[PDB]
Design an enzyme around this catalytic site. Structure first.
Site, mmCIF file in Angstrom:
data_model
loop_
_atom_site.group_PDB
_atom_site.id
_atom_site.type_symbol
_atom_site.label_atom_id
_atom_site.label_comp_id
_atom_site.label_asym_id
_atom_site.label_seq_id
_atom_site.Cartn_x
_atom_site.Cartn_y
_atom_site.Cartn_z
ATOM 1 N N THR A 45 65.784 43.224 -30.763
ATOM 2 C CA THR A 45 64.861 44.459 -31.074
ATOM 3 C C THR A 45 63.935 44.896 -29.831
ATOM 4 O OG1 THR A 45 64.361 43.046 -33.100
ATOM 5 C CG2 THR A 45 62.650 44.607 -32.473
ATOM 6 N N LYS B 198 63.849 50.387 -37.728
ATOM 7 C CA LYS B 198 63.167 49.109 -37.982
ATOM 8 C C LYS B 198 61.594 49.180 -37.293
ATOM 9 C CE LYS B 198 63.028 44.470 -36.300
ATOM 10 N NZ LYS B 198 63.547 43.101 -35.988
ATOM 11 N N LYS C 62 54.851 41.332 -31.586
ATOM 12 C CA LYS C 62 55.916 41.897 -30.479
ATOM 13 C C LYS C 62 56.402 43.439 -31.254
ATOM 14 C CE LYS C 62 60.707 41.400 -29.071
ATOM 15 N NZ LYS C 62 62.285 41.645 -29.604
HETATM 16 N N1 NAD Z 1 63.609 35.115 -34.911
HETATM 17 C C1 NAD Z 1 63.420 35.804 -35.886
HETATM 18 O O1 NAD Z 1 63.024 35.585 -36.694
HETATM 19 C C2 NAD Z 1 63.858 37.391 -35.565
HETATM 20 C C3 NAD Z 1 64.298 38.380 -36.825
HETATM 21 C C4 NAD Z 1 64.697 39.745 -36.386
HETATM 22 C C5 NAD Z 1 64.980 40.050 -35.109
HETATM 23 N N2 NAD Z 1 64.503 39.351 -33.841
HETATM 24 C C6 NAD Z 1 64.978 39.594 -32.672
HETATM 25 O O2 NAD Z 1 66.096 39.151 -32.099
HETATM 26 C C7 NAD Z 1 66.104 38.738 -30.827
HETATM 27 C C8 NAD Z 1 66.330 37.328 -30.174
HETATM 28 O O3 NAD Z 1 65.439 36.534 -31.090
HETATM 29 P P1 NAD Z 1 65.700 34.842 -30.919
HETATM 30 O O4 NAD Z 1 64.761 34.368 -32.091
HETATM 31 O O5 NAD Z 1 67.168 34.583 -30.900
HETATM 32 O O6 NAD Z 1 65.253 34.801 -29.505
HETATM 33 P P2 NAD Z 1 65.341 33.221 -28.711
HETATM 34 O O7 NAD Z 1 64.437 33.255 -27.634
HETATM 35 O O8 NAD Z 1 65.521 32.089 -29.832
HETATM 36 O O9 NAD Z 1 66.710 33.590 -28.148
HETATM 37 C C9 NAD Z 1 67.093 34.372 -26.971
HETATM 38 C C10 NAD Z 1 68.327 33.709 -26.209
HETATM 39 O O10 NAD Z 1 68.750 34.687 -25.199
HETATM 40 C C11 NAD Z 1 68.962 33.883 -24.099
HETATM 41 N N3 NAD Z 1 68.978 34.746 -22.892
HETATM 42 C C12 NAD Z 1 67.938 35.224 -22.090
HETATM 43 N N4 NAD Z 1 68.672 36.009 -21.209
HETATM 44 C C13 NAD Z 1 70.148 35.854 -21.470
HETATM 45 C C14 NAD Z 1 71.110 36.402 -20.690
HETATM 46 N N5 NAD Z 1 71.070 37.298 -19.690
HETATM 47 N N6 NAD Z 1 72.218 36.375 -21.238
HETATM 48 C C15 NAD Z 1 72.395 35.541 -22.195
HETATM 49 N N7 NAD Z 1 71.322 35.056 -22.961
HETATM 50 C C16 NAD Z 1 70.335 35.074 -22.455
HETATM 51 C C17 NAD Z 1 67.578 32.766 -24.004
HETATM 52 O O11 NAD Z 1 68.014 31.814 -23.187
HETATM 53 C C18 NAD Z 1 67.718 32.630 -25.610
HETATM 54 O O12 NAD Z 1 68.406 31.204 -25.995
HETATM 55 C C19 NAD Z 1 64.865 39.415 -30.477
HETATM 56 O O13 NAD Z 1 64.759 40.699 -29.812
HETATM 57 C C20 NAD Z 1 63.779 39.274 -31.711
HETATM 58 O O14 NAD Z 1 62.881 40.078 -31.445
HETATM 59 C C21 NAD Z 1 64.182 37.763 -34.405
#
Ligand code: NAD
Ligand code: 9ON
Ligand code: 9ON
Lengths: 289, 289
Positions: free
Chosen positions: B93, B168, B243
């Site tokens: 997102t 979204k 966010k």
């Molecule tokens: N968690 C929710 O409930 C939810 C719901 C809908 C959408 N989202 C969206 O999904 C996305 C990810 O959310 P999340 O909860 O999995 O976050 P998270 O922080 O749990 O996971 C992100 C991961 O990306 C990794 N990362 C960072 N830089 C990187 C790179 N260059 N290459 C590979 N990996 C890398 C981090 O180390 C981390 O494990 C966000 O943009 C968030 O807004 C989340």
């Protein structure tokens, strides 16, 4: 059942016609000759004064513009009513005015309900109004046969005043949603996201609400919505502005924190200065003001 | 059955990637947090030492990353490593502006690219019931469907690049406004003496109904599954809503749009997030009492 109908305006006239149509004897009063004439044209026996209308009634219904007028009506007719007459106020007035006229009526040995309505002139004519009722369950039961020929829905909200409180809380939410939906459509348009796409997403998602699925403020996605018909009401900005005024009264009387509801109220008050006759969804076009 | 590189194996990426492994895809993972990488390897992701290595032999590259900046940087790191005409799907997102920028970057490197941000949270991710809102070409989405289906309850094509993000962010802004408005209504009702159960029954049967009340009811009792009944445990955390509201304000600022209630809700959530980032966003009701 003999019913005195006090207030034979845009809503009171068709309601009283439905009561006639269901086999009640309907007595009426309205200080406008044209309203009174029209009502008499559908079988209401129209009297020169409200106390006269009330004299032989088993049920007294009010449909009046303000709590001050409802209150005055009550003190004008209560001594003319027979004991244990059923008073039903279907006006939209403040919760405070509702409870005060309820107490006044019961102090005279009358039974009283607040029963404000949603659905407009269209719903009134079609006998599909939604009555939101405050008062005793046993009083509502007695009233049910009178309410049914006017109504699509009858909901007991609680003790006296609850019907007014329920409607005002729902309408405050509605006003906020109609604005929020409008903001979403204009944002989408500036982002290059088509109206139909946003509509398809929002209606299948968490943001869905009547403000979009039925009242969509851009022409196309819902061919029947006011936006496809020059924003003809529907639900007028004037009426919405009236409800939000009441909501702000209730907020002021309780010390409640209602930031988005109050903001909506500000928005609609300003909009009503220019466009009171348009459907409230027309607010989409006053965002740059 | 294709080979998929999955970059970002966090709260969302880990379960997403597990469903891809369960559907028979070869999944090549990278995440620089070794904890996330370890957890993904346990469910069958082949984990690589570097993002460029994971992408080197993939038909599809999925990113599920925290911010636009991280996505931009990741693309800059990996695009030259991928094979020509590899399909990049960004399910992060991120701002609409960022999406368009990364999309153009991916295409200037000879890659196909979609924005496909999701709703459903972690429970949706694990259950493969996420909604993907997709921006990009219809033919690219057609190519992508076999990969998105094992993760998805809904796939909706929103328009051109960036339109997934746009849809979204528009929905979530509306949602934030609705959640505050519902909270306001319930608190006002309480002050007026209208029960939570009765307000619930009215609004959900009337024009004000919306997910924020019927599913996310912010008072305990009427919807036993809502967060209000489980100490406001998310659900949809205030941190995440804050966010998404930041991204909406980015969109509003980029477009010059006017969104009074959406921006007012952004301010409210930004303030609430300072201390209650960990609570479900319905917990904002606390600020009104
Ligand atoms: N968690 C929710 O409930 C939810 C719901 C809908 C959408 N989202 C969206 O999904 C996305 C990810 O959310 P999340 O909860 O999995 O976050 P998270 O922080 O749990 O996971 C992100 C991961 O990306 C990794 N990362 C960072 N830089 C990187 C790179 N260059 N290459 C590979 N990996 C890398 C981090 O180390 C981390 O494990 C966000 O943009 C968030 O807004 C989340
Ligand atoms: C069915 C309705 C009353 C009868 C009617 O007027 O339709 C109701 O009880 O809500
Ligand atoms: C979302 C997808 C179904 C995949 C699933 O049911 O998990 C589809 O119907 O396109």
């Amino acid at each position: 059942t003999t019913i005195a109908f006090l207030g034979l305006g845009n809503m009171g006239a068709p309601m009283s016609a439905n009561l006639v149509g269901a086999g009640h004897v309907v007595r009426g009063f309205d200080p406008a000759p044209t309203a009174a004439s029209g009502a008499a044209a559908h079988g209401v026996a129209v009297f020169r004064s409200a106390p006269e209308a009330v004299a032989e009634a088993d049920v007294v219904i009010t449909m009046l513009p303000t709590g001050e007028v409802v209150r005055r009506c009550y003190t004008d007719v209560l001594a003319a009513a027979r004991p244990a007459t059923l008073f039903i106020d279907s006006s939209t007035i403040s919760v405070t005015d509702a409870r005060e006229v309820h107490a006044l009526a019961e102090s005279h040995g009358m039974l009283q309900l607040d029963a404000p309505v949603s659905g407009g002139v269209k719903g009134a004519a079609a006998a599909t109004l939604a009555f939101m009722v405050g008062g005793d369950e046993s009083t509502l039961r007695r009233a049910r046969p009178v309410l049914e020929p006017m109504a699509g829905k009858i909901i007991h909200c609680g003790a006296a005043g609850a019907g007014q409180a329920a409607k005002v809380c729902n309408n405050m939410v509605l006003a906020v949603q109609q604005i929020a939906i409008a903001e979403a459509f204009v944002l989408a348009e500036k982002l290059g996201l088509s109206a139909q796409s946003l509509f398809d997403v929002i209606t299948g998602a968490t943001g869905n609400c009547w403000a979009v699925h039925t009242n969509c403020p851009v022409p196309g996605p819902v061919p029947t919505s006011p936006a496809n018909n020059d924003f003809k009401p529907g639900f007028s900005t004037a009426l919405m502005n009236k409800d939000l005024g009441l909501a702000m009264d209730a907020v002021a009387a309780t010390g409640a924190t209602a930031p988005l509801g109050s903001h909506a109220a500000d928005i609609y008050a300003k909009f009503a200065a220019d466009h009171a006759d348009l459907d409230f969804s027309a607010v989409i076009h006053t965002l740059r003001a």
